[PDB]
């Protein structure tokens, strides 16, 4: 019934734009953390951003601060990543992930992907 | 360098029971908490169980708790998950996950995957 239904990934250029988006069903967003994630070819899962529940704190890698925004809109249960000045080095398949209040980890849903591709 | 490989899905009858195991290579094993996620159709991946490095704490999602035991075998690099009472809401590939330590990440591989049908 936890749902976690990703979009927005693509195809660009360096220097290009792509707004990702996560909606969420069967828990409602205004109780939770939200983060991204990426897997980028042949490494491990590198953490993006975070969001707090209401939005009043984010946090971002080092990597992507000053070009990619996290946002969310607790109304319509969507999370989102605006991605700008996109980078070769950005191409990943980007993962929402809902925050956990449980002891067994600190997010328990992950979205099923979207591929963001920047080339050329 | 890490690998991490699923063994032991298939069919499965409604209440019948399956034991997954999860091999894995490229780091030290004993050093990390391993998971169990699944990806039922249609769906994101939702987390299963979580073992700590040596197994003294199990921790479980609601829909599997007391059905479902989680264990591994540091010796042989092996993670195992116990499935009982298997019902249609337990197909999904089921996937092992490296636990890491790193800000914002829980868990920082996954391996290939492993498809339990239940019907």
């Known amino acids: 019934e936890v749902q976690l239904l990703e979009s927005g990934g693509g195809l660009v250029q360096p220097g290009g734009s792509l707004r990702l988006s996560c909606a969420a069903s069967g828990f409602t967003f205004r109780g939770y953390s939200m983060a991204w994630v990426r897997q980028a070819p042949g490494k491990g899962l590198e953490w993006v951003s975070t969001?707090?529940?209401?939005?009043?704190?984010?946090y971002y890698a080092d990597s992507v601060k000053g070009r990619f925004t996290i946002s969310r809109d607790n109304s319509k249960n969507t999370l989102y990543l605006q991605m700008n000045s996109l980078r070769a080095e950005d191409t990943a398949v980007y993962y929402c992930?809902?925050?956990?209040?449980?002891?067994?980890?600190?997010?328990?849903?992950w979205g099923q992907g979207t591929l963001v591709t920047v080339s050329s | 360098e890490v690998q991490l490989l699923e063994s032991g899905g298939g069919l499965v009858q409604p209440g019948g029971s399956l034991r997954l195991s999860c091999a894995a290579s490229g780091f030290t094993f004993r050093g990390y908490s391993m998971a169990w996620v699944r990806q039922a159709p249609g769906k994101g991946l939702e987390w299963?169980?979580?073992?700590?490095?040596?197994?003294?704490?199990?921790?479980?999602?609601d829909s599997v708790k007391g059905r479902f035991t989680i264990s591994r075998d540091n010796s042989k690099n092996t993670l195992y998950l116990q499935m009982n009472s298997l019902r249609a809401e337990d197909t999904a590939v089921?996937?092992?996950?490296?636990?890491?330590?790193?800000?914002?990440?829980?868990?920082?591989?996954?391996?290939?995957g492993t498809l339990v049908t239940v019907s």
């Open positions: 969001i707090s529940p209401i939005g009043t704190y984010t």
């Open positions: 992930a809902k925050g956990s209040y449980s002891r067994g980890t600190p997010f328990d849903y």
